[PDB]
């Protein structure tokens, strides 16, 4: 068994944030949406088991789990923060997941809405045959 294989997959992390025309009752000034997807509408569900968005502790039920696409959370709030995101893999071994500290930042009223894109590359060296075929469908 001489052959070996390295598989790369591209992920897109990003978010939009816009000032609400009318703030909410709680004083939330912004609507925002954060996401994890594949580039060019590719289908990362082939190898992604779930995506967990860990919202700031001020949010109710802050651990937001997306078992199915789209991997995204839509919320309202008043301030930006660091949002840890875990991508779990359809994997039986290491790595079972990868983590990113996503900067969910907001722009003040009077500036254009936020439309932010963060590309990440993932490398799997010699994945299992099953995982390899899942990765390569994406």
């Amino acid at each position: 068994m001489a052959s070996s294989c390295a598989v790369q997959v591209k992920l897109e992390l990003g978010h939009r944030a816009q000032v609400r025309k009318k703030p909410t009752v709680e004083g939330f000034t912004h609507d925002w949406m954060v996401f994890v997807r594949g580039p060019e509408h590719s289908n990362i569900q082939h190898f992604v088991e779930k995506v967990v968005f860990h919202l700031h502790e001020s949010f109710p039920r802050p651990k937001r789990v997306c078992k199915d696409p789209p991997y995204k959370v839509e919320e309202s709030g008043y301030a930006g923060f660091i949002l840890p995101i875990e991508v779990y893999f359809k994997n039986k071994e290491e790595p079972r997941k990868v983590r990113f500290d996503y900067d969910l930042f907001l722009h003040l009223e009077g500036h254009p809405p936020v439309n932010h894109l963060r590309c990440e590359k993932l490398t799997f060296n010699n994945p299992t045959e099953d995982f390899r075929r899942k990765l390569l469908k994406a």
Binding site: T29, G80, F81, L106, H107
Partner: peptide, 7 residues
């Protein structure tokens, strides 16, 4: 340019 932040 950013809003305030929480931590």
């Amino acid at each position: 340019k950013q809003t305030a932040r929480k931590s």
